[PDB]
Amino acid sequence: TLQQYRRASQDKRLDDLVDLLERFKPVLAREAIMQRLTIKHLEGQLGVWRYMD
C-alpha cells in the first residue's frame, strides 16, 4: 500500500536525478576542455583561433 502511494514521486525523483546527471556532464566536459586549452597555453602553442573555436 505504501509503495502504491509513493509511486509517482519516486519515479519523478529518479527522472530528475537522471536529468541532473545529464546536466552536470557537459560542465565536466567544458572543464576538461579548459584544462587542455590551459595546458597548451602554458606551452606557448595555443592560437586564439583554436581558443575561439
Binding site: 505504501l2 509513493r6 541532473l20 546536466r23 560542465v27 567544458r30 586564439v48 581558443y51 575561439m52
Partner: protein
C-alpha cells in the same frame, strides 16, 4: 582584416569571465533549491487503538 578582429580579441576576456560567472551562478542555484523532504506517516498507535475498538473492548 585589422580593426574588427582586434576589437573582438579585446572583447574575449571579459565575455569569458562573465560566462564563467553565469555558469557558477546556475550551478549555485541548482544546489540552493535542493531540500531534504521528511515525510510524515500515520502513527500506528491510532491503528492499534482502532483495532481495539473494533473488538468491542
Amino acid at each position: 582584416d585589422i580593426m574588427v578582429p582586434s576589437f573582438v580579441y579585446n572583447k574575449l576576456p571579459v565575455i569569458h569571465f562573465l560566462q564563467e560567472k553565469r555558469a557558477e551562478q546556475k550551478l549555485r542555484r541548482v544546489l540552493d533549491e535542493t531540500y531534504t523532504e521528511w515525510t510524515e506517516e500515520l502513527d500506528q498507535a491510532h491503528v492499534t487503538d482502532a483495532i481495539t475498538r473494533s473488538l468491542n473492548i
